[PDB]
Short mmCIF file of all heavy atoms in Angstrom, two decimals:
data_model
loop_
_atom_site.label_atom_id
_atom_site.label_comp_id
_atom_site.label_asym_id
_atom_site.label_seq_id
_atom_site.Cartn_x
_atom_site.Cartn_y
_atom_site.Cartn_z
N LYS P 197 75.67 116.34 125.90
CA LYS P 197 76.10 117.62 125.57
C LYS P 197 75.86 117.97 124.08
O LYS P 197 76.44 119.04 123.69
CB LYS P 197 77.53 117.94 126.04
CG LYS P 197 77.77 117.63 127.43
CD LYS P 197 77.07 118.61 128.36
CE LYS P 197 77.18 118.39 129.78
NZ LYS P 197 76.44 119.23 130.62
N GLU P 198 75.31 117.11 123.38
CA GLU P 198 75.08 117.36 121.96
C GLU P 198 74.47 118.56 121.55
O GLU P 198 74.90 119.28 120.72
CB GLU P 198 74.33 116.18 121.19
CG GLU P 198 75.09 114.79 121.31
CD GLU P 198 74.83 114.04 122.64
OE1 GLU P 198 74.11 114.43 123.57
OE2 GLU P 198 75.33 112.84 122.68
N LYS P 199 73.32 118.78 122.25
CA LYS P 199 72.61 120.17 121.92
C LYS P 199 73.53 121.28 122.30
O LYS P 199 73.44 122.37 121.52
CB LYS P 199 71.28 120.12 122.61
CG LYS P 199 70.10 119.83 121.81
CD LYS P 199 70.34 118.50 121.06
CE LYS P 199 69.47 118.39 119.66
NZ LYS P 199 69.95 117.14 118.81
N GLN P 200 74.23 121.34 123.34
CA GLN P 200 75.03 122.34 123.62
C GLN P 200 76.18 122.56 122.67
O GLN P 200 76.59 123.67 122.26
CB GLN P 200 75.73 122.19 125.14
CG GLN P 200 76.71 123.29 125.62
CD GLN P 200 77.38 123.04 126.96
OE1 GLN P 200 78.53 123.55 127.03
NE2 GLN P 200 76.80 122.30 127.81
N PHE P 201 76.84 121.35 122.20
CA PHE P 201 77.80 121.56 121.24
C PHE P 201 77.19 122.18 119.87
O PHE P 201 77.77 123.10 119.27
CB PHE P 201 78.37 120.08 120.86
CG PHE P 201 79.22 120.02 119.68
CD1 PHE P 201 80.56 120.31 119.55
CD2 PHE P 201 78.58 119.76 118.41
CE1 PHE P 201 81.42 120.21 118.41
CE2 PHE P 201 79.30 119.74 117.17
CZ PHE P 201 80.67 119.95 117.20
N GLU P 202 76.04 121.78 119.50
CA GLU P 202 75.52 122.10 118.16
C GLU P 202 75.23 123.62 118.13
O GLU P 202 75.43 124.30 117.41
CB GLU P 202 74.27 121.24 117.86
CG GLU P 202 74.71 119.76 117.57
CD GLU P 202 73.45 118.87 117.42
OE1 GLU P 202 72.30 119.40 117.04
OE2 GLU P 202 73.63 117.72 117.39
N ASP P 203 74.64 124.05 119.33
CA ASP P 203 74.29 125.52 119.44
C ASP P 203 75.59 126.34 119.39
O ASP P 203 75.64 127.41 118.72
CB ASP P 203 73.50 125.75 120.75
CG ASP P 203 72.06 125.27 120.62
OD1 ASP P 203 71.59 124.88 119.45
OD2 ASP P 203 71.27 125.39 121.59
N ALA P 204 76.58 125.85 120.20
CA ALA P 204 77.74 126.77 120.24
C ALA P 204 78.56 126.58 118.98
O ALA P 204 79.34 127.63 118.67
CB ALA P 204 78.63 126.14 121.39
N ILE P 205 78.60 125.54 118.29
CA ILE P 205 79.53 125.50 117.10
C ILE P 205 78.73 126.34 116.04
O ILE P 205 79.51 126.93 115.16
CB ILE P 205 79.64 123.97 116.63
CG1 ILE P 205 80.87 123.92 115.43
CG2 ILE P 205 78.56 123.38 115.96
CD1 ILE P 205 82.20 124.38 116.07
N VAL P 206 77.45 126.43 115.90
CA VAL P 206 76.80 127.29 115.00
C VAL P 206 77.10 128.72 115.26
O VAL P 206 77.41 129.43 114.31
CB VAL P 206 75.34 127.10 114.90
CG1 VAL P 206 74.54 128.09 114.12
CG2 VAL P 206 75.11 125.65 114.26
N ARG P 207 76.96 129.14 116.55
CA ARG P 207 77.37 130.53 116.89
C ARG P 207 78.86 130.84 116.46
O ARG P 207 79.25 131.88 116.06
CB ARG P 207 77.16 130.80 118.37
CG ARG P 207 75.73 130.91 118.77
CD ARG P 207 75.63 131.27 120.28
NE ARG P 207 75.53 130.22 121.04
CZ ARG P 207 76.39 129.87 122.09
NH1 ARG P 207 77.37 130.82 122.30
NH2 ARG P 207 76.23 128.77 122.78
N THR P 208 79.77 129.75 116.78
CA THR P 208 81.12 129.94 116.42
C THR P 208 81.34 130.24 114.94
O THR P 208 82.00 131.05 114.47
CB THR P 208 81.92 128.73 116.97
OG1 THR P 208 81.72 128.51 118.20
CG2 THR P 208 83.48 129.03 116.39
N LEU P 209 80.67 129.33 114.01
CA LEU P 209 80.82 129.36 112.54
C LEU P 209 80.22 130.72 112.04
O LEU P 209 80.63 131.29 111.08
CB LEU P 209 80.25 128.25 111.95
CG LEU P 209 81.05 126.92 112.25
CD1 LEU P 209 80.32 125.68 111.68
CD2 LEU P 209 82.48 126.96 111.81
N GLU P 210 79.11 131.26 112.67
CA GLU P 210 78.46 132.41 112.18
C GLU P 210 79.46 133.62 112.35
O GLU P 210 79.38 134.63 111.69
CB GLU P 210 77.18 132.59 112.92
CG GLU P 210 76.07 131.76 112.22
CD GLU P 210 75.72 132.12 110.94
OE1 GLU P 210 75.47 133.29 110.62
OE2 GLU P 210 75.65 131.28 109.99
N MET P 211 80.33 133.52 113.50
CA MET P 211 81.35 134.57 113.79
C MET P 211 82.55 134.30 113.00
O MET P 211 83.26 135.22 112.39
CB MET P 211 81.76 134.72 115.24
CG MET P 211 80.46 135.17 116.07
SD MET P 211 80.85 135.14 117.77
CE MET P 211 82.13 136.37 117.98
N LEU P 212 82.88 133.07 112.59
CA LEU P 212 84.13 132.70 111.99
C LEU P 212 84.10 133.26 110.44
O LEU P 212 85.12 133.35 109.83
CB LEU P 212 84.45 131.19 112.06
CG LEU P 212 85.69 130.70 111.49
CD1 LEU P 212 86.80 131.24 112.28
CD2 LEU P 212 85.63 129.09 111.45
N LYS P 213 83.04 133.31 109.91
CA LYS P 213 82.85 133.59 108.50
C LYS P 213 83.38 135.07 108.24
O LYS P 213 83.32 135.42 107.06
CB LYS P 213 81.31 133.59 108.05
CG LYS P 213 80.46 134.53 108.67
CD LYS P 213 78.96 134.21 108.27
CE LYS P 213 78.02 135.19 108.90
NZ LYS P 213 76.66 134.82 108.62
N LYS P 214 83.64 135.88 109.22
CA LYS P 214 84.19 137.28 109.02
C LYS P 214 85.75 137.11 108.74
O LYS P 214 86.37 138.13 108.13
CB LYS P 214 84.11 138.04 110.25
CG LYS P 214 82.65 138.54 110.43
CD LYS P 214 82.65 139.49 111.69
CE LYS P 214 81.34 140.11 111.80
NZ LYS P 214 81.32 141.13 112.98
N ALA P 215 86.41 135.90 108.91
CA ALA P 215 87.93 135.94 108.64
C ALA P 215 88.15 135.97 107.26
O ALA P 215 87.32 135.47 106.33
CB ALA P 215 88.41 134.60 109.26
N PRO P 216 89.28 136.57 106.84
CA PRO P 216 89.57 136.84 105.38
C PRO P 216 89.84 135.47 104.72
O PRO P 216 90.42 134.44 105.40
CB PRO P 216 90.90 137.56 105.51
CG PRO P 216 90.92 138.18 106.83
CD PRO P 216 90.14 137.38 107.78
N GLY P 217 89.44 135.30 103.58
CA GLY P 217 89.61 134.00 102.77
C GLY P 217 88.65 132.84 103.18
O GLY P 217 88.93 131.70 102.83
N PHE P 218 87.66 133.17 104.05
CA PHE P 218 86.64 132.19 104.45
C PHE P 218 85.82 131.86 103.34
O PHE P 218 85.24 132.82 102.65
CB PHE P 218 85.86 132.75 105.60
CG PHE P 218 84.68 131.78 105.95
CD1 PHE P 218 84.97 130.93 107.04
CD2 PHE P 218 83.38 131.98 105.49
CE1 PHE P 218 83.89 130.03 107.46
CE2 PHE P 218 82.41 131.17 105.92
CZ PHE P 218 82.63 130.11 107.00
N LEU P 219 85.72 130.54 102.84
CA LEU P 219 85.01 130.25 101.69
C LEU P 219 83.74 129.25 102.15
O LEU P 219 83.07 128.78 101.23
CB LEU P 219 85.80 129.39 100.75
CG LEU P 219 87.07 130.17 100.16
CD1 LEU P 219 87.89 129.14 99.20
CD2 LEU P 219 86.69 131.34 99.57
N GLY P 220 83.41 129.15 103.41
CA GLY P 220 82.27 128.34 103.73
C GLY P 220 82.39 127.35 104.82
O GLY P 220 83.60 127.00 105.07
N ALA P 221 81.37 126.91 105.47
CA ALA P 221 81.49 125.88 106.53
C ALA P 221 80.21 125.02 106.57
O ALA P 221 79.10 125.54 106.20
CB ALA P 221 81.83 126.58 107.86
N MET P 222 80.47 123.81 107.07
CA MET P 222 79.21 123.11 107.33
C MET P 222 79.62 122.09 108.37
O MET P 222 80.71 121.84 108.72
CB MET P 222 78.73 122.29 106.13
CG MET P 222 79.77 121.41 105.60
SD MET P 222 79.21 120.58 104.01
CE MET P 222 80.62 119.60 103.51
N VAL P 223 78.50 121.64 109.22
CA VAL P 223 78.69 120.84 110.27
C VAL P 223 77.96 119.43 109.97
O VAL P 223 76.72 119.40 109.70
CB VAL P 223 78.09 121.26 111.65
CG1 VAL P 223 78.31 120.37 112.72
CG2 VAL P 223 78.85 122.69 112.01
N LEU P 224 78.75 118.36 110.02
CA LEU P 224 78.25 116.97 109.72
C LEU P 224 78.13 116.15 111.03
O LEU P 224 79.10 116.15 111.77
CB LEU P 224 79.19 116.35 108.77
CG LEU P 224 79.15 116.63 107.19
CD1 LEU P 224 78.78 117.99 106.92
CD2 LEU P 224 80.31 115.99 106.45
N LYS P 225 76.98 115.61 111.21
CA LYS P 225 76.65 114.80 112.38
C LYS P 225 76.47 113.45 111.96
O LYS P 225 75.68 113.07 111.24
CB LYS P 225 75.36 115.37 113.11
CG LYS P 225 75.04 114.70 114.26
CD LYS P 225 73.67 115.23 114.99
CE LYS P 225 73.36 114.62 116.44
NZ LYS P 225 72.21 115.46 116.93
N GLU P 226 77.28 112.51 112.61
CA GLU P 226 77.31 111.11 112.14
C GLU P 226 75.88 110.54 112.47
O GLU P 226 75.42 110.52 113.58
CB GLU P 226 78.42 110.29 112.78
CG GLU P 226 78.53 108.89 112.34
CD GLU P 226 79.49 107.96 113.04
OE1 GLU P 226 79.24 107.62 114.17
OE2 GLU P 226 80.57 107.89 112.45
N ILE P 227 75.33 109.73 111.49
CA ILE P 227 74.07 108.94 111.75
C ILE P 227 74.30 107.54 111.65
O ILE P 227 73.45 106.80 111.99
CB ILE P 227 72.94 109.49 110.74
CG1 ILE P 227 73.27 109.08 109.29
CG2 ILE P 227 72.79 110.92 110.80
CD1 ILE P 227 72.12 109.13 108.38
N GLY P 228 75.50 107.07 111.15
CA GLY P 228 75.76 105.73 111.05
C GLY P 228 76.92 105.32 110.15
O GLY P 228 77.65 106.32 109.81
N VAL P 229 77.15 104.13 109.85
CA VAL P 229 78.18 103.71 109.09
C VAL P 229 77.57 102.68 108.03
O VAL P 229 76.79 101.79 108.39
CB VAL P 229 79.25 103.04 109.81
CG1 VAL P 229 80.44 102.60 108.77
CG2 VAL P 229 79.87 104.04 110.79
N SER P 230 77.96 102.77 106.71
CA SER P 230 77.65 101.94 105.63
C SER P 230 78.57 100.66 105.70
O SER P 230 79.67 100.76 105.32
CB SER P 230 77.64 102.57 104.38
OG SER P 230 77.63 101.64 103.23
N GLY P 231 77.94 99.51 106.16
CA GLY P 231 78.77 98.24 106.10
C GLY P 231 79.26 97.95 104.74
O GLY P 231 80.26 97.47 104.52
N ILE P 232 78.26 98.05 103.80
CA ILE P 232 78.63 97.58 102.47
C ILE P 232 79.71 98.51 101.72
O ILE P 232 80.73 98.04 101.22
CB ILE P 232 77.32 97.57 101.53
CG1 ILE P 232 77.79 96.86 100.17
CG2 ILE P 232 76.85 98.86 101.22
CD1 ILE P 232 76.43 96.50 99.44
N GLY P 233 79.66 99.85 102.10
CA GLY P 233 80.73 100.84 101.63
C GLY P 233 81.98 100.54 102.40
O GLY P 233 83.04 101.00 101.90
N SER P 234 82.01 99.93 103.58
CA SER P 234 83.21 99.66 104.38
C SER P 234 83.73 98.20 104.25
O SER P 234 84.62 97.96 104.93
CB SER P 234 82.97 99.94 105.85
OG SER P 234 82.37 101.29 106.13
N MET P 235 83.13 97.52 103.27
CA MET P 235 83.50 96.13 103.07
C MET P 235 83.46 95.36 104.31
O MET P 235 84.41 94.45 104.60
CB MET P 235 84.99 95.98 102.36
CG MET P 235 85.11 96.68 101.03
SD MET P 235 86.85 96.37 100.30
CE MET P 235 86.48 94.61 99.80
N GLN P 236 82.49 95.53 105.10
CA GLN P 236 82.31 94.95 106.41
C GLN P 236 81.07 94.04 106.34
O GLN P 236 79.94 94.54 106.37
CB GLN P 236 82.15 95.91 107.59
CG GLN P 236 83.39 96.64 107.94
CD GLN P 236 84.39 95.75 108.73
OE1 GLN P 236 85.56 96.19 108.79
NE2 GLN P 236 83.88 94.70 109.27
N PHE P 237 81.40 92.73 106.05
CA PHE P 237 80.34 91.83 105.91
C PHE P 237 80.48 90.80 107.22
O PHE P 237 81.23 90.91 108.19
CB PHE P 237 80.51 90.90 104.70
CG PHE P 237 80.65 91.84 103.44
CD1 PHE P 237 81.81 92.25 102.94
CD2 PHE P 237 79.47 92.17 102.76
CE1 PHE P 237 81.92 93.01 101.85
CE2 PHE P 237 79.54 92.98 101.65
CZ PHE P 237 80.73 93.29 101.20
N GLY P 238 79.48 89.87 107.17
CA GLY P 238 79.43 88.69 108.08
C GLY P 238 80.66 87.76 107.63
O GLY P 238 81.42 88.08 106.76
N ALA P 239 80.70 86.63 108.21
CA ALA P 239 81.67 85.61 107.83
C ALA P 239 81.69 85.32 106.45
O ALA P 239 82.65 85.11 105.82
CB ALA P 239 81.53 84.35 108.81
N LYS P 240 80.46 85.06 105.81
CA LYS P 240 80.52 84.60 104.47
C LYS P 240 81.11 85.69 103.55
O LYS P 240 81.96 85.27 102.72
CB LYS P 240 79.06 84.33 104.11
CG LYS P 240 78.79 83.97 102.50
CD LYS P 240 77.29 83.96 102.20
CE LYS P 240 77.24 83.60 100.63
NZ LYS P 240 75.66 83.70 100.27
N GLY P 241 80.75 86.91 103.65
CA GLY P 241 81.20 87.98 102.77
C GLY P 241 82.77 88.18 103.13
O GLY P 241 83.43 88.60 102.11
N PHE P 242 83.12 88.13 104.43
CA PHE P 242 84.49 88.36 104.82
C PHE P 242 85.39 87.29 103.93
O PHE P 242 86.35 87.67 103.41
CB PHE P 242 84.68 88.20 106.25
CG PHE P 242 86.17 88.40 106.77
CD1 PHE P 242 86.66 89.65 106.77
CD2 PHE P 242 86.94 87.34 107.20
CE1 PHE P 242 88.01 89.82 107.14
CE2 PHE P 242 88.12 87.53 107.69
CZ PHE P 242 88.72 88.80 107.60
N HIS P 243 85.08 86.08 104.05
CA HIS P 243 85.84 85.04 103.24
C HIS P 243 85.78 85.40 101.78
O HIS P 243 86.75 85.23 101.11
CB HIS P 243 85.40 83.70 103.52
CG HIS P 243 85.49 83.31 104.91
ND1 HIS P 243 86.75 83.22 105.66
CD2 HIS P 243 84.65 82.81 105.81
CE1 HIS P 243 86.59 82.83 106.83
NE2 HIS P 243 85.38 82.54 107.00
N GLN P 244 84.64 85.82 101.17
CA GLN P 244 84.57 86.19 99.87
C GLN P 244 85.51 87.34 99.36
O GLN P 244 86.15 87.35 98.31
CB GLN P 244 83.17 86.43 99.35
CG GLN P 244 82.30 85.21 99.40
CD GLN P 244 80.72 85.64 99.12
OE1 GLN P 244 80.20 86.52 99.66
NE2 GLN P 244 80.19 84.89 98.33
N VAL P 245 85.63 88.34 100.27
CA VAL P 245 86.54 89.44 100.11
C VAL P 245 88.03 88.97 100.16
O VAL P 245 88.82 89.32 99.18
CB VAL P 245 86.31 90.46 101.14
CG1 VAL P 245 87.47 91.56 101.15
CG2 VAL P 245 84.94 91.14 100.91
N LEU P 246 88.37 88.09 101.18
CA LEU P 246 89.72 87.70 101.39
C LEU P 246 90.12 86.83 100.19
O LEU P 246 91.34 86.72 99.79
CB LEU P 246 89.98 87.09 102.66
CG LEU P 246 89.92 87.81 103.95
CD1 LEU P 246 90.50 87.04 105.05
CD2 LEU P 246 90.45 89.20 103.83
#
Side-chain angles (χ1 to χ4, degrees):
Chain P
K197 303 297 180 187
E198 292 90 351
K199 261 52 205 170
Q200 180 186 154
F201 168 88
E202 295 176 13
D203 284 355
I205 194 69
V206 167
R207 283 183 276 123
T208 298
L209 294 174
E210 284 291 313
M211 294 173 69
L212 187 62
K213 68 190 184 183
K214 289 181 170 180
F218 178 89
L219 300 184
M222 56 184 181
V223 178
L224 276 42
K225 181 178 184 172
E226 181 183 85
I227 68 168
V229 181
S230 170
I232 191 165
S234 307
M235 298 186 83
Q236 286 287 163
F237 305 96
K240 177 189 177 183
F242 180 70
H243 295 304
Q244 292 174 314
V245 169
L246 290 199

